[PDB]
Amino acid sequence: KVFGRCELAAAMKRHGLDNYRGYSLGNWVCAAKFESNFNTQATNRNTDGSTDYGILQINSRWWCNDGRTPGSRNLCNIPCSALLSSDITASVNCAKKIVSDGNGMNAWVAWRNRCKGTDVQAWIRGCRL
């Protein structure tokens, strides 16, 4: 499923991401825009053999099980395919645990390079929340 901008902001707000651990809603929408282009089915392969899954591109090295990343852990206790659903609950819950492990949203390379320090507020401007 390819979300609309305001559609995904409303979905993330209902699932508790607005000001989660100090990050306004504009940060999460901005990260999803540049990590996945709002597409829940996005996958990308990393040079170490691991794969990023979903609208926030969560890594199989630490967070989910896909059965082909030997030596990895499964700290979100889910199969990686559950992160490709049109229902974003699984990806939101796993993202809450990631942003809490000390390093914040810096774990998302695209947020660091393209959203941090910008007016993230503009990503939710005009939406009914």
Side-chain angles (χ1 to χ4, degrees), residues 12-82:
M12 278 168 179
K13 180 171 193 31
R14 136 160 180 264
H15 282 114
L17 281 169
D18 196 355
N19 283 97
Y20 187 85
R21 295 278 313 241
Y23 289 96
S24 66
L25 199 67
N27 282 288
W28 299 99
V29 169
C30 187
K33 171 65 189 173
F34 291 127
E35 290 282 355
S36 77
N37 212 357
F38 299 143
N39 175 26
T40 54
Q41 298 191 251
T43 57
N44 275 289
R45 186 71 183 273
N46 304 312
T47 60
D48 70 336
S50 68
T51 298
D52 299 345
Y53 295 94
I55 204 169
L56 281 192
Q57 287 291 276
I58 294 171
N59 202 3
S60 67
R61 171 75 46 191
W62 315 101
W63 307 105
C64 61
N65 178 54
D66 62 5
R68 75 168 183 200
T69 317
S72 67
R73 290 203 280 201
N74 183 14
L75 308 168
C76 284
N77 318 303
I78 65 172
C80 297
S81 57

Side-chain angles (χ1 to χ4, degrees), residues 102-121:
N103 300 298
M105 292 184 78
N106 290 293
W108 287 274
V109 60
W111 178 84
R112 199 154 53 54
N113 289 335
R114 309 177 78 168
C115 303
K116 183 182 201 170
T118 63
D119 174 42
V120 307
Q121 185 276 330

Side-chain angles (χ1 to χ4, degrees), residues 2 7 9 31 42 63 66 75-76 82 87 94 99 107 115 122 124:
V2 181
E7 180 182 13
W63 307 105
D66 62 5
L75 308 168
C76 284
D87 177 329
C94 188
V99 76
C115 303
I124 63 172

